A paper describes a structure:
NALCN channel is a voltage-modulated sodium-selective ion channel. It mediates sodium leak currents that are essential for setting the membrane excitability. Sequence analysis shows NALCN protein shares a similar domain arrangement to the pore subunit of eukaryotic voltage-gated sodium channels NaV or calcium channels CaV. In addition to the NALCN subunit, FAM155, UNC79, and UNC80 subunits are indispensable for the function of NALCN channel.
Here, we describe the structure of rat NALCN and mouse FAM155A in detergent to the resolution of 2.7 Å, which provides enhanced details and additional structural insights into the mechanism of this important channel complex. We prepared the NALCN–FAM155A complex in a buffer with sodium chloride and GDN detergent, mimicking the symmetric sodium solution used in electrophysiology recording. The map quality was sufficient for modeling the stable portions of NALCN and FAM155A which encompass 73% of NALCN and 37% of FAM155A. Interestingly, the arrangements of VS are highly asymmetric, with the voltage sensor of domain I (DI-VS) being the most off-axis. On the extracellular side, the CRD of FAM155A protrudes from the top of the complex into the extracellular space while the two predicted transmembrane helices of FAM155A were invisible, probably due to their flexibility. The CRD of FAM155A binds at the top of the NALCN channel. Extracellular loops of domain I, III, and IV (L5I, L5III, L5IV, and L6IV) in NALCN form a platform for FAM155A binding. Unexpectedly, we found the 1387–1390 region of domain IV has two possible alternative conformations, both of which were modeled in the allowed region in the Ramachandran plot validated by Phenix29. Therefore, the arrangement of charged residues at the HFS layer of NALCN selectivity filter (EEK_, − − + 0) is similar to NaV (DEKA, − − + 0) but different from CaV (EEEE, − − − − ), providing a plausible explanation of the sodium selectivity of NALCN. The gate is tightly sealed by several hydrophobic residues on S6 helices, indicating the current structure represents a non-conductive state.
Author numbering:
A (entry chain A): 31 to 95, 105 to 336, 374 to 616, 751 to 765, 843 to 858, 873 to 1578
B (entry chain B): 188 to 200, 226 to 262, 267 to 389
């Protein structure tokens, strides 16, 4: 009675939160900064140690000494241990910088007690555990798949690259003596061979930096030294982290094609597809939750207040207020910003809205006011802004209230409000996920804090704010490897593997589960409710026996003819080629050819090879303009210009065609010899760069892609408005609190703006990663520069435009950590909250809304948006059975002892598991680079010879034991034969030639066998099919993304071809040719600092030399051009069009990956039916007669069992179904399989209304005729 | 009327004909009209006409010149180790950068007005020239996060870099 009260449990929960807070303050640095806190936290500990001890003895005295009680007792134990340890620490006995504080590691777990009440759901615990087991098995499978790809690319990186140890240094660098002052600026890699990589210029030599005394500890952790380093590097790259500069090193050290192929395929497979498979898994988890939840069951002042004119006036006042507050831009170091006219405007608006709230209260009473749940937010704003206007909380955290008033503006658009209610759903799915995310972040920060607060020279976990910033940064992925690297260096060499496992596991969970849950929650909010889907449709033992029982208990004239002929001309064993050749009219085929040739020509245009001065580049231009003039004239004469239903201008595509034609015609007629920067001629060249967009109109698959993408533009635009509103809120706040406060002296030893003059010796960046800390008595490279009081040049909050640009750059999470650090170091640490909140609201939620709306519109275009999850699973099963074929296993021979025993040997699961282990082991043989001057490569190649001889005997066994004819039946067997023949070829060459290309061929054969490993595992094969079939299904989407990228690449060669080298524009990334521009634009969406590149391309005087005549002589950048170009490209590609790849991966995952459900025909059932059909169909026809059907049905065992003890009626129904289907003959393995699938599900759930009525009519007819024949057998006797 | 590089304070002690060794665009006539090292600060050109004080000021000029030379050697050492020196700009080469940087540094050490210049330019403008012709050199980012700042910049937050009372020295470009 003393512990079951209502208030006591709330007390225990609040005290669990308080204990979390207590342990989050218990670090040595926190006690150095605030000594009182020490005793404070002790007291709290003691107090809680009392109370919880009570709730243990006051409870385990009732019951004799729920599986929460053991947890609560371990918590009490942790509290007691922390108490006695802190008593020892108070008495100065323990150092407090010793690892004893690690005993407080479990204490944060007490936070679970504060939320344990919210662990009661509407589903029984059995259904919850079934959901969790299904999701766990799927996550295990996808993790195995991920590990397969990681090992594949790790071996490829070991063999295609090596160590990046050759650097350009000054030639007078003696061995053993290299210093910071011998390297180049910036540090650059090179190749010692005259044909690969970067060649050092005169004055520099390419040295090894390993014969020179440098250690692989002061040279990084990345690279491809051995298989472990390489796997870690591949995993880092799959997060789009640090792979671009690794690629730059590879390009400088090795041939270029290697790096391009390697890293582009790594980003495409690992960073896009394999990553999207995890999102598919979480979306399937939510689909399974749905399936489980479904199968479980004044007299006049009031009138003027009610008028819409008053609402319009108040919303206009909110608009004016927030616009005026946002427009308080920085005006210089000689103004006040404290009691100025903006403050008086703020006072006036605060008084106005306080009067509005008072009036609403005085009209509707108080309780009727406050019940509105929107008047609650308005009263919160009234109070917060009134406190804000008090002239000591002006321009403080209280400003958050003022800038929040823009939320009221959501009531101008009913559609935006409905979209908000739709996409954010209930405050119990998304809100619960946000609370779980905050709690997980707090607990992991507290745990990492207790792990690392004592470690010397590690300022990432000294206090809870720092530990939380570190864990949040790992969540956002921006520089997470840097956090882990600093920690790994700090902890030492013995514990580094354990903390590396910790950080990798945390990153894996965070980025592959938490963010995927955000996506899945948004998608579930956008997906119609199951009951609503069924209601909207209405407005318009063995599983066979279970379904049978359910089914039972339920019972003028001329020259237009010639033009029309020419523009409509078009155009079976091989009908695929004939459909490819008749895809478009001959006129469109010619025009596609001419478009492609013109784009290929434009790929040679550069600032120094111009189309206006080079005739070979004008060939394609003249051809394009002439042929498009002919095409337009023909189509306009034939199909009319505007009026005709198939006129030329009837959609946006024809308008764009006319636009492109006119641009190219004006350019070719003009052909200006001088093109000034930012002129109309350069704008004309940029518009001419839009020529690839004609492929989007001439190819119907591209038209389909564009049409389906723009079918969801309303939702895309509403998400854009929500993100703009968020950025406006935070940009107004940033202008009010940060304007003029981000500047400081570029000399770190200066503090006051009055001391910031003269010159100082600045240190220049040599190597960001390399750690040649060795400096005997010399200083770091640098030189003398003026002291300047400057903004960071990449972002400021001085006006609302700069603030919105900075927040848009932070939204991409690229370089956001530098913004965070600048705001915390130059304004104050309290203003870290600001940036973090934005990063949580804009990236984890904001961009996830784009992901969700794009996937939802995709699913709506393919038609599956109004189907229930059971109906969608039925469609996926019906597609899975439409491609299943009879099994490829010929029978075992009779009394052929040389083949029967060999049959039992090759078909025994021990043999297959042994072959898979051998594939993995030969794969492991490629762990060190197979060189030709390395000794270990000879043992490795000899063992590879042993392996390929083993696989030779395996293949000969499977060919003689099975058949030479039947061995060729399996495609996997054919691949294995191909790889084994390549293997024996390599063996005879390797012992004959023994060259370096011999080792290359051996490594290649090993890689192809490793790739064979994917056919020896069910889940691996299903996931590989998912990936490759979704890559096939995304061909035209990838073509469209490439077409957009090509347009942008041409435009960027025109705009940024000669931009002065800057922070990120350099010899590795620039727009000096179309190929360089293409590679740069690819890297800009897959893990490079695109905003740094944007700010390099915005360079203006006095940082460049303008030219008044031509752009190729001007060295400068386009400011507005760079803004529009980079922002629009990043939005279009990274936020919109890659989510199409996500949508396709999700579709194909639900199609190909099958789990053994209870109420559906599964993969094992398909295999069992295949075995039974193999035994019934003798000569392997794939088609049996009618009586073999009853034989097969009697034969089926397991889950397809039809036992003649309780389900004889079912047997007769199925046999008569197979009789009736073709008037009595020759069913075809899909008739019987379709019959099984139908008789194996509850058709009321799985089928749609048309198919349901058809099937129920069919089954009623069958049952009636079976009853008729039974009655006739009776009347016969 | 040709130049006369200064070598000894005593030997040279028509001042518009004696140029400094490294900062070879400043005559002694111009230095005595404005420059004065504070320790020996008595040289307002009234120490040459009316000579130990002169030796003290000319040796101060030579020390200024020598320190400017050391700093310039550090700069050209950085510029030598810059490998993209031939690619960074279609308009500027390392020699242009070197010349304008030497002019800027020499103006930092001798903040005086130059006379008898064919073409004249505000001396502060040489700062801007270093921003224009020299390559972007990323500064090291351990103590302070520079953002996207370059190593050499001239004008701060909300400042008109060119103002009144400028030395307005020669133009050598
Ligand atoms: C990027 C946005 C991510 C920010 C997430 C913030 C958040 O979640 O707060 C949610 C608030 O969401 C909002 O952003 C509402 C505020 C929108 C302000 C609209 C400003 C009006 C601008 C005029 C637009 C012109 C309309 C033109 C359209 C044709 C709260 O969720 P809820 O309303 O309670 O719904 C759940 C029901 N229990
Ligand atoms: C930072 C704060 C963010 C909160 C802002 C979100 C607004 C709504 C808050 C979310 C919310 O209240 O959801 C409620 C609370 O959310 C949760 O369930 C908590 C999530 C579990 C966190 C577990 C923490 C331990 C994890 C570390 C290991 C959901 O409960 P309910 O369904 O409404 O009631 C069930 C009683 N039958
Ligand atoms: C890491 C975690 C280490 C220890 C976690 C402490 C778990 C406490 C176990 C208590 C327990 O077994 O609760 C049992 C069930 O346990 C639960 O369901 C736990 C509640 C879910 C909380 C969700 C927290 C998961 C957060 C994921 C963590 C991911 C971070 C990984 C980063 C490296 C209650 O079952 P019962 O005993 O049958 O209840 C009725 C009996 N009358
Ligand atoms: C690592 C990155 C992965 C690369 C992307 C994944 C590669 C996917 C693998 C193979 C692609 C297979 C292509 C799928 C074929 C789809 C079949 C189809 O629907 O098209 C059938 C015909 O096939 C076609 O549509 C051919 C496409 C028309 C011409 C293509 C024009 C695009 C031009 C490419 C851009 C050129 C660049 C410009 C020059 C630099 C339709 O037949 P129908 O009965 O007439 O209707
Ligand atoms: C968000 C950023 C998305 C970036 C996507 C950019 C794609 C390149 C611009 C597309 C120009 C190609 C125009 C193709 C086109 O006209 O698609 C037609 C209309 O598509 C559109 O609505 C696009 C209009 C806005 C595009 C900007 C599809 O109609 P249809 O298949 O021909 O059906 C005929 C009877 N109704
Ligand atoms: C809500 C946005 C209200 C626009 C505030 C305009 C205040 C303003 O003049 O910003 C000026 C610059 O800011 C802008 O250009 C406004 C751009 C607004 C874009 C966001 C929508 C500040 O003058 P400055 O710093 O001397 O150059
Ligand atoms: C490179 C990747 C090579 C793929 C090897 C593992 C493929 C296993 C798989 O996904 O399903 C298998 C797909 O089969 C294939 O198509 C393997 C591809 C080989 C094509 C023909 C072999 C000669 C040319 C290579 C199913 O095999 P089956 O049912 O016995 O007929
Ligand atoms: C996430 C999806 C929706 C988000 C919308 C993305 C675009 C909105 C985000 C940021 C736009 C910021 C507006 C740029 C104003 C720059 C502030 C400023 O004071 O610069 C001033 C601007 O002066 C100018 O001449 C720039 C005028 C060009 C305006 C360009 C704005 C369009 C940006 C295109 C973005 C399109 C996004 C993708 C939509 C498909 C001058 O400063 P200065 O240093 O003296 O030269
Ligand atoms: C609930 C509490 C916090 C509300 C506080 C409101 C008070 C403190 C605010 C509201 C109006 C404000 C005043 C408005 C007018 C002026 C005159 C001006 O020349 C200086 C500021 C000054 C003197 C303000 C002082 C602070 C002020 C009096
Ligand atoms: C079959 C027809 C329609 C296609 C060929 C069109 C002919 C007329 C086109 C194609 C290539 C064109 C040439 C391409 C290059 C040049 C160099 C330029 O400085 C003058 C025009 C000139 C000489 C063009 C003249 C017209 C031209 C010869
Ligand atoms: C290293 O280089 C410095 C600089 O020239 C030189 O003084 C020193 O003797 C060298 N030491 C060795 C071991 O080469
Ligand atoms: C280094 O290279 C420079 C320029 O080629 C040359 O003058 C110098 O003598 C070289 N020093 C060596 C080779 O030690
Ligand atoms: C440059 O690095 C040195 C270390 O050699 C350090 O002492 C100095 O403070 C740094 N200078 C600047 C301006 O960062």
């Amino acid at each position: 009675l003393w512990i079951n009260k209502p208030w006591v449990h709330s007390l225990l929960r609040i005290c669990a939160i308080i204990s979390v807070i207590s342990v989050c303050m218990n670090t040595p640095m926190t006690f150095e900064h605030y000594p009182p806190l020490q005793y404070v936290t002790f007291t709290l500990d003691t107090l809680l140690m009392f109370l919880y001890t009570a709730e243990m003895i006051a409870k385990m005295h009732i019951r004799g000494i729920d599986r929460w009680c053991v947890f609560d007792g371990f918590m009490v134990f942790c509290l007691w241990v922390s108490l006695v340890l802190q008593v020892f620490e108070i008495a100065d006995i323990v150092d407090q910088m010793s690892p004893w504080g690690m005993l407080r590691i479990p204490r944060p777990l007490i936070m679970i007690r504060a939320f344990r009440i919210y662990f009661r759901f509407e589903l029984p615990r059995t259904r919850i555990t079934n959901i969790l087991k299904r999701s766990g098995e799927q996550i295990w499978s996808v993790s195995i798949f991920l590990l397969f790809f990681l090992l594949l690319y790790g071996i490829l990186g070991v063999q295609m690259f090596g160590t990046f140890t050759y650097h350009c240094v000054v030639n007078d660098t003696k061995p053993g003596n290299v210093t910071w002052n011998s390297l180049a600026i910036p540090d650059t890699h090179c190749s010692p061979e005259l044909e690969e990589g970067y060649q050092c210029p005169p004055g520099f030599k390419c040295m090894d930096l390993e014969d020179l005394g440098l250690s692989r500890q002061e040279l990084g952790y990345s690279g491809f030294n051995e298989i472990g380093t390489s796997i870690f590097t591949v995993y880092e790259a799959s997060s789009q982290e640090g792979w671009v500069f690794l690629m730059y090193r590879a390009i400088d050290s090795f041939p270029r094609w290697r790096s391009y192929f390697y890293f582009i395929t790594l980003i495409f497979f690992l960073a896009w597809l394999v990553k999207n498979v995890f999102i598919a898994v979480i979306i399937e988890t939510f689909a399974e939750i749905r399936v489980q939840f479904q199968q479980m069951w004044p007299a006049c002042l009031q009138k003027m207040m009610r008028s819409s004119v008053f609402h319009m006036f108040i919303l206009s006042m909110v608009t004016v207020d927030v616009i005026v507050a946002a427009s308080n831009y920085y005006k210089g170091e000689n103004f006040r910003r404290q009691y100025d006219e903006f403050y008086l405007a703020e006072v006036a608006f605060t008084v106005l809205f306080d009067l509005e709230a008072l009036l609403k209260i005085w009209c509707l009473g108080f309780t009727g006011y406050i019940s509105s749940s929107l008047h609650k937010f308005e009263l919160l704003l009234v109070i917060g802004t009134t406190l804000h206007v008090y002239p000591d909380l002006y321009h403080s955290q209280f400003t958050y209230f003022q800038v929040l008033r823009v939320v009221r503006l959501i009531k101008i658009s009913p559609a935006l409000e409905d979209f908000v209610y739709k996409i954010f759903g209930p405050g119990k799915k998304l809100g619960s996920l946000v609370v779980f995310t905050a709690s997980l972040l707090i607990v992991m920060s507290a745990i990492s804090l207790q792990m690392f607060c004592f470690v010397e020279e590690l300022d990432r976990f000294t206090t809870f704010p720092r530990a939380f910033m570190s864990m949040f940064q790992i969540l956002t992925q921006e520089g997470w490897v840097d956090v882990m690297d600093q920690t790994l260096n700090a902890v030492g060499h013995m514990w580094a593997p354990l903390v590396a496992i910790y950080f990798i596991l945390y990153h894996l969970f965070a980025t592959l589960i938490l963010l995927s849950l955000f996506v899945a929650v948004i998608l579930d909010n956008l997906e119609l409710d199951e009951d609503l889907k069924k209601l909207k449709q209405l407005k318009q033992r063995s599983i066979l026996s279970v379904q049978h029982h359910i089914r039972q208990e339920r019972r003028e004239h001329r020259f237009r003819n010639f033009c029309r002929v020419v523009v409509r001309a078009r155009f079976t064993k091989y009908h695929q080629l004939y459909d490819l050749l008749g895809l478009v009219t001959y006129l469109d085929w010619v025009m596609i050819t001419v478009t492609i040739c013109s784009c290929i020509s434009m790929m040679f245009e550069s600032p120094f090879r111009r189309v206006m001065h080079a005739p070979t580049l004008q060939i394609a231009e003249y051809v394009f303009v002439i042929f498009m003039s002919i095409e337009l004239n023909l189509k306009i004469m034939a199909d009319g210009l505007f009026f005709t239903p198939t006129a030329v201008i009837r959609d946006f595509g024809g308008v764009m065609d006319i636009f492109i034609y006119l641009v190219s015609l004006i350019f070719l007629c003009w052909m200006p010899q001088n093109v000034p920067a930012e002129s109309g001629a350069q704008l004309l060249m940029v518009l001419r760069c839009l020529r690839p967009l004609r492929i989007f109109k001439l190819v119907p698959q591209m038209r389909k892609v564009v049409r389906e993408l723009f079918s969801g533009f309303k939702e895309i635009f509403l998400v854009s408005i929500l993100l703009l509103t968020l950025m406006l809120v935070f940009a107004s706040f940033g202008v009010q609190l940060f304007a003029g406060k981000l500047a400081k002296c570029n000399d770190p030893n200066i503090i006051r703006r009055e001391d910031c003059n003269g010159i100082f010796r600045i240190n220049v960046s040599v190597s960001k990663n390399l750690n040649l800390k060795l400096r005997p008595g010399e200083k770091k490279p640098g030189f003398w520069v003026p002291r300047v009081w400057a903004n960071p040049r990449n972002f400021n909050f001085d006006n609302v435009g700069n603030a919105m640009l900075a927040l848009f750059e932070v939204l991409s999470l690229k370089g956001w950590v530098e913004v965070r650090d600048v705001i915390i170091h130059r304004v104050g640490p309290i203003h870290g909250i600001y940036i973090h909140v934005f990063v949580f609201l804009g990236c984890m939620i904001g961009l996830t809304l784009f992901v969700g709306v794009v996937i939802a519109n995709f699913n709506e275009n393919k038609g599956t948006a109004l189907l229930t999850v059971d109906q969608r699973r039925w469609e996926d099963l019906k597609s899975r059975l439409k491609i299943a074929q009879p099994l490829h296993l010929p029978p075992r021979p009779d009394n052929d002892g040389f083949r029967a025993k060999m049959y039992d040997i090759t078909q025994h699961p021990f043999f297959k598991r042994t072959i898979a282990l051998l594939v993995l082991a030969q794969s492991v043989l490629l762990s060190v680079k197979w060189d030709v001057e390395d000794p270990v490569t000879v043992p490795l190649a000899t063992m590879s010879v042993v392996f390929t001889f083993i696989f030779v005997l395996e293949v000969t066994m499977k060919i003689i034991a099975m058949s030479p004819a039947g061995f060729w039946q399996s495609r996997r067997n054919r691949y294995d034969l191909l790889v084994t023949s390549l293997g024996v070829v390599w063996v005879v060459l390797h012992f004959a030639l023994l060259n370096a290309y011999t080792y290359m061929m051996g490594a290649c054969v090993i890689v192809f066998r490793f790739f064979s490993i994917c056919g020896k595992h069910v889940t691996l094969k299903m996931l590989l099919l998912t990936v490759v079939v979704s890559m096939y299904k995304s061909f035209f989407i990838i073509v469209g993304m490439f077409l957009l990228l090509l347009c942008y690449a041409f435009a960027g060669v025109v705009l940024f071809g000669t931009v002065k080298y800057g922070e990120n524009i350099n010899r590795h990334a620039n727009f000096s040719s179309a190929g360089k521009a293409i590679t740069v634009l690819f890297r800009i969406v897959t893990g490079e600092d695109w905003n740094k590149i944007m700010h390099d391309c915005m360079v203006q005087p006095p940082f460049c030399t303008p030219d008044e005549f031509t752009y190729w002589a001007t060295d400068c950048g386009n400011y507005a051009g760079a803004l529009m170009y980079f922002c629009s490209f990043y939005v279009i590609i990274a936020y919109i069009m890659l989510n199409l790849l996500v949508a396709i991966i999700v579709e194909n995952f639900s199609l190909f990956y099958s789990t053994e459900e209870d109420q559906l025909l599964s993969y094992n059932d398909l295999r069992h039916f295949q075995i039974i059909w193999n035994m019934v169909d003798d000569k392997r026809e794939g088609v049996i007669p009618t009586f073999r059907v009853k034989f097969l049905l009697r034969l089926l065992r397991g889950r397809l069992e039809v036992d003649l003890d309780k389900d004889k009626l079912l047997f007769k129904h199925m046999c008569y179904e197979m009789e009736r289907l073709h008037n009595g003959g020759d069913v075809t393995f899909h008739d019987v399989l379709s019959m099984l699938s139908y008789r194996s599900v509850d058709i009321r759930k799985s089928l749609q209304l048309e198919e349901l009525l058809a099937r129920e009519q069919l089954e009623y007819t069958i049952e009636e005729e079976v009853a008729k024949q039974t009655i006739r057998m009776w009347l016969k006797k | 009327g040709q130049c006369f590089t200064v070598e000894s304070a005593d030997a040279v002690c028509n001042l518009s004909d004696f140029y400094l060794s490294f900062c070879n665009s400043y005559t002694l006539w111009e230095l005595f009209s404005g420059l004065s090292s504070p320790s020996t600060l008595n040289c307002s050109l009234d120490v040459v006409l009316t000579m130990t004080t002169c030796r003290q000021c000319i040796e101060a000029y030579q020390d200024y010149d020598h320190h400017a030379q050391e700093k310039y050697e550090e700069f050209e050492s950085v510029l030598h180790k810059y490998l993209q020196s031939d690619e960074y700009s279609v308009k500027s080469c390392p020699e242009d950068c070197k010349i304008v940087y030497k002019a800027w540094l020499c103006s930092q050490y001798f903040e005086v007005t130059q006379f008898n210049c064919r073409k004249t330019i505000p001396c502060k403008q040489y700062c801007l020239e270093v921003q224009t012709r020299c390559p972007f050199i990323l500064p090291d980012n351990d103590e302070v996060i520079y953002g996207g700042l370059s190593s050499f910049i001239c004008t701060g937050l909300y400042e008109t870099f060119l103002t009144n009372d400028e030395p307005e020295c020669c133009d050598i470009r």
